[PDB]
């Protein structure tokens, strides 16, 4: 099979500035007609890959002029001359010289910007949920950059583990910030034995942690 490799595996670019991604193939993809059996895609999370370039350099239908493919043989480059927010996602090169069709690893482009500290919001379990036997406490972080952020849950000052989960949005179209949802899930029985629920956030942009808390039954 043909092995496709990309470099870098991630990059951060500010809007208006150029990005490039390199792709290498283990076999030459050069065609008799001078084109190459090489295609580039952009994939946004959960969505089908979108064709950007095929035949090495042919820009696909409706693809913006800022995307260009170049190279020949075993070495190829995707250039985005002026990065825009909507260009964030994972880029793949792919050979179609033979089956099995093979893809590179994927390069995640994110939009660079200045540091932004998260705002933090805490929500107690709904009364409706409590009646079914489960208690979820939710801590939402908004408007932060870079993507790394740490949530610590405390119940009466005891650090929690093995009972929470989190996920993070893609970057906001307008300000390129991330948001994060952390959920602490306890049984109703355990939840009602304790008083102080706290989510403590730390981040590059925070000079001190931000802790949002509530006393059970006071919301």
């Amino acid at each position: 099979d043909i092995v496709m490799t990309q470099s870098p595996l991630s990059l951060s670019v500010t809007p208006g500035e150029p990005a490039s991604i390199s792709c290498r193939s283990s076999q030459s993809l050069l065609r008799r007609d001078g084109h190459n059996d090489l295609e580039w895609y952009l994939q946004k999370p959960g969505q089908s890959p979108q064709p950007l370039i095929y035949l090495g350099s042919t820009r696909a239908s409706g693809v913006p002029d800022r995307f260009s493919g170049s190279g020949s043989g075993t070495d190829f480059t995707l250039k985005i001359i002026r990065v825009e927010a909507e260009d964030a996602g994972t880029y793949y090169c792919m050979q179609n010289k033979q089956t099995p069709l093979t893809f590179g690893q994927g390069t995640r482009l994110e939009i660079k910007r200045t540091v932004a500290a998260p705002s933090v919001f805490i929500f107690p379990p709904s009364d409706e949920q409590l009646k079914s036997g489960t208690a979820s406490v939710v801590c939402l972080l908004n408007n932060f950059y870079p993507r790394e952020a740490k949530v610590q849950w405390k119940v009466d000052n005891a650090l929690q583990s093995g009972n929470s989960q989190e996920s993070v949005t893609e970057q906001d179209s307008k300000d390129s910030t991330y948001s994060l949802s952390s959920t602490l899930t306890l049984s109703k029985a355990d939840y009602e034995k304790h008083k102080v629920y706290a989510c403590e956030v730390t981040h590059q942009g925070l000079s001190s942690p931000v802790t949002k808390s509530f006393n059970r039954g006071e919301c």
Binding site: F121, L140, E218
Partner: protein
């Protein structure tokens, strides 16, 4: 709109069989070789197999790791191609795409369908209105819905009954619960305070899997 529409996925028992359909909508599939490609959540793209046009006697080819367990077929009269999978295993769980090749008139990927090889039945999310207990941000109001304990993790989407100027909805990907094998997420809406006064409510609408959608009222504070 012209596109490739997939169906026939979802949950399937280990050892079970599932036939995916790839139906052309607004173009003719006959001129293309039809390929199948899959992607496990958070992972890369992997070719599954192909079928050539009838002109080439519909010749098939399969990925090494699934060869003995696949039949790709096509029905040009229905403008549809099929991926029959058999003896499915946990490691076949993935989002499956069909892809057309070889037709200068048409280049299309299907929207993808998630195949989950599991002994579990589906579980609809339990959707709850949330009320902020910390402070509201200057000028705006935050409300949210908890979307708890669902399976499989996709498809899942949430929309709100307010949108437009000054309104931002945040939708977080599903994550696996710390115990119990289900998934949970939330959806948040931030809107001008004047647009979410006491006595006003907003609804979150939650779609999941192939079951009926849910609509939950979320009171403004």
């Amino acid at each position: 709109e012209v596109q490739l529409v997939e169906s026939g996925g979802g949950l399937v028992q280990p050892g079970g069989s599932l036939k995916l359909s790839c139906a052309a909508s607004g173009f003719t599939l006959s001129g293309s070789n039809v390929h199948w490609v899959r992607q496990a959540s958070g992972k890369g793209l992997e070719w599954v197999g192909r079928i050539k046009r009838n002109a080439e006697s519909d010749a098939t080819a399969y990925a090494a790791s699934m060869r003995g367990r696949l039949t790709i077929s096509r029905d040009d009269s229905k403008n549809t191609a099929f991926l029959q999978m058999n003896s499915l295993k946990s490691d076949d769980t993935a989002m499956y795409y069909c892809v057309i090749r070889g037709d200068v008139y048409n280049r299309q990927w299907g929207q993808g369908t998630l195949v989950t090889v599991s002994s579990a039945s589906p579980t609809s999310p339990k959707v709850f209105p949330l009320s902020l207990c910390s402070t509201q941000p200057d000028g705006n109001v935050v409300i949210a819905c908890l979307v708890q304990g669902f399976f499989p993790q996709e498809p899942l989407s949430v929309t709100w009954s307010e949108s437009g100027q000054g309104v931002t909805a945040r939708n977080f990907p599903p994550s696996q619960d710390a115990s119990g094998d289900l998934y949970t997420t939330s959806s948040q809406l931030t809107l001008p305070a004047t647009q979410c006064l006491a006595g006003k409510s907003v609804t979150c609408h939650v779609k999941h899997y192939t079951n009926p959608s849910q609509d939950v009222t979320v009171p403004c504070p």
